[PDB]
Design a protein around this ligand. Structure first.
Ligand SMILES: [Cl-]
Length: 162
């Protein structure tokens, strides 16, 4: 199990523009295109990202390419973030994957808002952190996915995903 397989499980793979859980236009493996109500804007963003006239449809290869870019961006983003970096550095490999998952899903800013939970991860207080992170909008909106990530942080293993 690795980050890609993990996220592939949590986001799925769609080759046609779609609405994510909050109604935003997305494609591929959880690649957000735009937060605008317009499919036109979405289709525009899509072409800009792929570099071709897509007409809201991409190929597998294209979906995987966007995915490679997003994971890399997430990692670099974490490593640049003053708040996130220290947390990342203090963790074991599995739990680092869990932090990357959250960043991929909600952005650095969204994650940075788990101040309290993050501080607990840093102090290796596994159970407390899990309980705290569950008190969030994130958990209430996508509970099964949140549960999988939370268990990953609590246990440091891939169980939730196997
Ligand atoms: Cl709550």
């Amino acid at each position: 199990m690795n980050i890609f397989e993990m996220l592939r499980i949590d986001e799925g793979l769609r080759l046609k523009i779609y609405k994510d859980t909050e109604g935003y236009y997305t494609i591929g493996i959880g690649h957000l295109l735009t937060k605008s109500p317009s499919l036109n804007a979405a289709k525009s963003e899509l072409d800009k990202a792929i570099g071709r006239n897509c007409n809201g449809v991409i190929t597998k290869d294209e979906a995987e390419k966007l995915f490679n870019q997003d994971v890399d961006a997430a990692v670099r983003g974490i490593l640049r973030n003053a708040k996130l970096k220290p947390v990342y550095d203090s963790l074991d490999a599995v739990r680092r994957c869990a932090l990357i998952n959250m960043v991929f899903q909600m952005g650095e800013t969204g994650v940075a808002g788990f101040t309290n939970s993050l501080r607990m991860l840093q102090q290796k207080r596994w159970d407390e952190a899990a309980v705290n992170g569950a008190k969030s909008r994130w958990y209430n909106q996508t509970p099964n996915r949140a549960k999988r990530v939370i268990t990953t942080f609590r246990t440091g293993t891939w169980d939730a995903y196997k």
